[PDB]
Amino acid sequence: VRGLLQELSSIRHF
Amino acid sequence: LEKRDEMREVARDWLRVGYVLDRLLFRIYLLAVLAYSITLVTLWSI
Structure with a gap:
């Protein structure tokens, strides 16, 4: 499992 | 992005402050x- 999704989620949020 | x-x-917050002050001063000016x-x-009457 990689924590790349928590970054993309934030970017999409912005 | 977050930067x-x-x-x-x-x-946005400074916009809030500015707006509140502007409205208040508008009230003051109008009443004045x-x-x-x-x-x-x-x-005029006297």
Whole structure:
């Protein structure tokens, strides 16, 4: 499992 | 992204402050004009 999704989620949020 | 977003939020808060002050000062100015006018007409009548 990689924590790349928590970054993309934030970017999409912005 | 959050680097820009942060400044955007700060600008939003300053916008809030500025707006509140602007509305308040608008009330003050309006009431001042009305009072000056009522003094004007009370002088006009006498």
